[PDB]
């Protein structure tokens, strides 16, 4: 087509996605970590996630409003993930890398994934 | 704005 | 902080987000405009338009399926905004642009108005 | 990946 195209307007639009979750404003699920709870928005974590993607465009899932994950899956990995799913920021460090990594492979977050193996393979 |  | 940044994320979101719209997926509010309804995701509206954030955090109309638009808006205008919200693409024409630029001052979109009050300062 |  003959479109014009606003280059920061991506980005704009996840920063306002961001602040309607930091003000709680029209999230509809909480995602249920080892008995640690999180607010968020259906779309946002299906368009991040292929594990959200498969469970929200279940028929009987896609109307729930609690999702329990997986036991082993830990909370400071998923918290850091679900920042990273509404900034684009991941906040990766020695002290969290292996947490951060499984917790990727589980929600399948091919980006994060490849980043994590790369910064482990620096460090052997 | 940018012709992308 | 010390994070990380994925470039392409906010695109691939909003990509994403589109996908989901086109395969008609969670969306959870229809646009009637002239008669003319438009299905979409309130949280996206919202990150776009400070007419749609101002309507879905009222107590009252958060909970509404059905948002009615003035009149006087026009149909096409709405559609080629609304592909913009979820593209950052604005299909801009000289058949187009008051259309354009009245939807964008109506649904309060501040960078689309200034892109259009340029495009017609050209012309004069 | 970038140092933002
Ligand atoms: O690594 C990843 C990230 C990711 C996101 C999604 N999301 C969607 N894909 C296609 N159409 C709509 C949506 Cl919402 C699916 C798989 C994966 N895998
Ligand atoms: O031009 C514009 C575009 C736009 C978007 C919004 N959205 C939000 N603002 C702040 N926190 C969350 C959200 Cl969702 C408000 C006003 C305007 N004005
Ligand atoms: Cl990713
Ligand atoms: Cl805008």
Redesign the interface.
């Given at each position: 087509d003959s479109?014009?195209?606003?280059?920061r307007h991506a980005s704009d639009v996840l920063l306002n996605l961001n602040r309607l979750r930091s003000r709680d404003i029209l999230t509809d699920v909480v995602i249920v970590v080892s008995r640690e709870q999180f607010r968020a928005h259906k779309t946002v974590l299906m368009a991040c996630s292929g594990l959200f993607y498969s469970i929200f465009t279940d028929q009987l899932k896609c109307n729930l409003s609690v999702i329990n994950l997986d036991p082993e899956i830990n909370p400071e990995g998923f918290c850091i993930l679900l920042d990273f799913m509404y900034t684009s920021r991941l906040n990766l460090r020695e002290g969290n890398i292996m947490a951060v990594m499984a917790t990727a492979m589980y929600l399948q977050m091919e980006h994060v994934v490849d980043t994590c193996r790369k910064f482990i393979k620096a460090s052997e | 704005?940018?012709?992308?």
């Open positions: 479109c014009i195209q606003f280059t | 704005w940018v012709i992308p």
